[model samples]
Target chain A: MLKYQQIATEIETYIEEHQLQQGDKLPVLETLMAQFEVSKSTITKSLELLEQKGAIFQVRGSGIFVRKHKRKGYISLLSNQDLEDFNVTSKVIELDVRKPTPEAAENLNIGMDEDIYYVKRVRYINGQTLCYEESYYTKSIVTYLNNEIVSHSIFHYIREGLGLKIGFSDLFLHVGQLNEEEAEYLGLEAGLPKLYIESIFHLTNGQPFDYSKISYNYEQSQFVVQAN
Target chain B: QQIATEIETYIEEHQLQQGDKLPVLETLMAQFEVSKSTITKSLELLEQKGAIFQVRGSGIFVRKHKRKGYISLLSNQGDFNVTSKVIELDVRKPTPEAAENLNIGMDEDIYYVKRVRYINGQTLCYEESYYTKSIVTYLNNEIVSHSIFHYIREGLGLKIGFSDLFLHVGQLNEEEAEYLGLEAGLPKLYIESIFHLTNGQPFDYSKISYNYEQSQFVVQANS
Candidate 1:
């Protein structure tokens, strides 16, 4: 992150911690500049960013004032480890090799007959069932996989043992009905609305390696979006 | 005919800010030459869009209306100033990919639109979208340049239930780069979506390519 962005985050945290209300005035720019130990330009940029986020407003002759009205909290897109402060664990249910589905084959750039490794797991957060996921990996790229490896982190093995760098992913989200299988595993009724996400992971070298689909319990999971 | 859009454009033209008072219903009806019921529905739509708020026996007020992310399909918080320039708008046969996703047959036609969206004078993203011609029925440059969701809801009276979104990081093509004022082949965020009607029919499919350098997606889960 940029210096100003870091400072902006810190200042936002300070505002929340201090319990500032609407129209509450902030300290002078000089105090902030001195306290943050940054140049005037940095503080100005920081305030500008905050204003863009609807967190604060500034007046030329007056001072900065709080503009916060509402807030929504969420987690990072790709990683479960980012579920900070939330205890999370996974149990592997199915581990096997199978022919790729047409959708997976097209996404992974492999032939229809190509074999792939599949793993299905249920994730528990703080002793509650959160979500279930099914993942498909290109066998040629992954090279090897076992029950133990998947029960842990397969990405850990792919990085450490295979020595391949993980890159970006294509993600899809929807509010879909839970199927009978998912309903049975998630302890919910079929045809209930649930959060559904699909993702395709690609390597830095542009090789598509992994495809996954996940279904989250509706009462437990919600997606939040912040404007840029 | 889109009273809601006219009101938004009026707010923009008048430079109305938070806590500003809007015209009374009588004045609004006269201004738009619409019926009382029409005026009510228009204001209701605006309220739903987070552009204005109407209190019982009180007047409508302009809301602070912070802009929600354009990628947001379900959530509503506030409204921001956004405009678009239509680059392409025409009818054509549905592609195989679009046909399968839209669950339509080859006999049906589709409307393809490409546009570049701007917010506060900054080029934000390039959008390529396809709509089912039979469902959408109406098309024009004016509606395309403004808000189509408004037309879908207020004009056509279609209730949107939910949407399917797919996000990825990919390099921009030449046309997208030129329109977004970015270098070709630069890594950018791309979103693919299929919007559904209340009856579970897919109506619109779009791919949005964003040019912002710092782009991330957030999701919240309750414990």
Candidate 2:
């Protein structure tokens, strides 16, 4: 990321960690420059980016104030849970490298002949079945994968191991019925209503690398969204 | 008995427009041949629906009703020009989930409606919704084919508050896949939601599915 972008990210993170609400005043420009150890122009540019994203606004006589909530209403597209908060764990049902499906190829922007890692798992949260996830990773992008890492959060590995910056994701959600195989994994009855989500993950450079098909247990799930 | 609906129908038959006074409770009970409790229940139902309001010492009066505007299955969304096709519409017993979500007693029935939304002439999503019959006392094929939210707000006169939604992905069944013009076992997006009134009472529960291949949901997230 550019220097200004990195500083902008730091300021945004600070706002979030401090639980700043709308109209909340941010630190003065001099304070930010001293805190970030950057020059005034850099901090000004960073604040400009935040202003464009509708995160905060600056007044000539006063410091910046929060104009809107984080991300302009784009929160996490992933499942609504903090893994650390629950007794969360995953069991690898299946993991292998295979040829990419046409849909996967298009999503990952890979050729049909290209190889991909296909992983299937059942995630348990708080000792209850959370979701059955079928995930595909672009081999060219991921470079490495195995049973051990797959048992944990692959995104964590992608971030920590590969040092890749996680970016935005395109997510789709709807209602569906659990198939017999999925039902067996979840220990639920087949043909029962379930929440299904398809997400395509991209890096900061806008390169698509991951696609996930997840089926969540309906009785245990609820998604809260705010809209204008 | 749909005494609330009957009262609405009586208002219509008598050409009682908004601001017109309704007959007293004794007159309504005598005319409908029901008990005082039934009349009071019906009046309360209408009042909740935004159809009528009662004043102390004075009789009830018809209310001027207007729903805010059109709202999609997922409100505050942008898509192609959308149209609805109602596949099924009727009153039936509530499922266990519906009974709990709607907070309705087992004795109460619900209006069940199934619909498919078309975007640019392609089947986009399928929805099955259950509404509490007491509050939404009346519905028709026309209303279901159009917008249920409009009917709930303008026709039934209710103020919608917010909804609790759950989203995920699952394989489509034979029927749903066919409806969406996809093969069975194909994955799709799912949303299960409970909608509440402004007064904090849930009045509707719905399950909606979308063809994921043709759909892309873009959301903003802080990186």
Candidate 3:
């Protein structure tokens, strides 16, 4: 292995063993220089590699600290049934029900004045933001959505409790530039292009039930689709 | 009419022709004295109307006027229950490969069905199906706008069943890549399927492809 990669592995092992959190200071640069028995430039290069992977962030005159792990969600589109098998496991970012915006109403095929349950989440995988999703469901159908339910998977409650089976969906995929709030939440630069997927889900009988928008930072993630 | 007039004026002022690249956002913003979002909204509207096209990692370009075709046979089968939406439709002379796929004689009429299919509102696939004019003529406008299966079952009264289905992965072409806002040569799942009547008469065939970025395909079998 290359020297920098070896150094990165060592630091990664330390992080795992110590169970470090965001903002926890790493060992000082000089200490790593001595411990690795490498020049200061080599230590800097290893740290730089980690930082590029979103594993750490450095503060001038202060020290380097472990970065928070971001969350990620996955969507599988192979099933012909209405309800797709979607899995999301992340820290609860935010959850609320609000009036539908014009675009939201159009996508969900609801009245412009309709109320919708909006669930905004930042999904991470292995401590990096792979994607961000903003979902809107018909307020009438999905009631009593709490933070606990939002943190895991919304479909679990919807299917187990409501007994609503997903039937079919309409989706639009495109490339979009990240806006200010989206950039901040996903830890991306404003105006950087990212993959955007917008979808509207219908129940078993073809009634629209859910509207969702997701943005992915392609640098860290990939997807697979099977055809029939 | 207002939009049409604006488009005409814009075209005339810029000496724009079919396939010409449009000005950048900043230039359009200054020229039209419109906000960035407003200009963006207008461009989106034009794109939906087939007046323009956007290329991924590139700028928007003018679109040629072409007859849009529809996919009419692959509607919700009674058991499978899937819905279909027209993402794009166009009538063009069959290419050599398309003619062979449809089993039609060379120099014959053909249409293309470009659809973005969704299951439960999630995008599952983007399919480009080919057909001869004879098959497409039986379809009506309402069926074209709504459900193709509805027309197949109610209008044509054809009981269709799965014939043969094949799957693979292929790279996106430049035009497809631009239309789908994907980079050229990206991997996409490809499916070619045919349908037959209960009598085992082949009736329809389709070629469907999808980007995996938004969906996953799974199958279950019992032994």
Number of the top-ranking candidate, with DockQ as the measure: 2
Model 2, span B175-208: residue lDDT tens? 9998999888766667777776655456888888
Ranking by DockQ: 2, 1, 3
| Per-candidate chain B TM | 0.65, 0.63, 0.50
Candidate 1 structure quality by residue, lDDT tens digits, B80-185: 4678999999999999888866768987999999999987677878998999998998888999998898899889998775444554544578988899997786
lDDT leaderboard ranking? 2, 1, 3
lDDT of 3 by residue, B17-135 (tens): 54578788788778767688888888865653445666555787764321121121122210223456776666667888666555567776666667766555555466776666666
Residue-level lDDT of model 3, residues A34-71, one tens digit each, is 99999999999999888755567676767887753311
Docking class of 3: incorrect
DockQ of each: 0.02, 0.12, 0.02
Error of 3 at B214 (Å): 19
Candidate 2 achieves a global lDDT of 0.73
The whole-model lDDT of each prediction reads 0.72, 0.73, 0.62
TM-score of candidate 3 on Cα atoms, chains taken together? 0.37
Those runs of model 2 whose alpha carbons end farther than 4 Å from true positions after fitting are A1-84, B1-222
lDDT of 1 by residue, A1-228 (tens): 799999999999989899985456888899999989999999999998897666776655677877553223333454531343456677899989999889878767789798899899987777777789998999999988998788666787988889987754445555445789998888877866556677777664446799888888665554323221
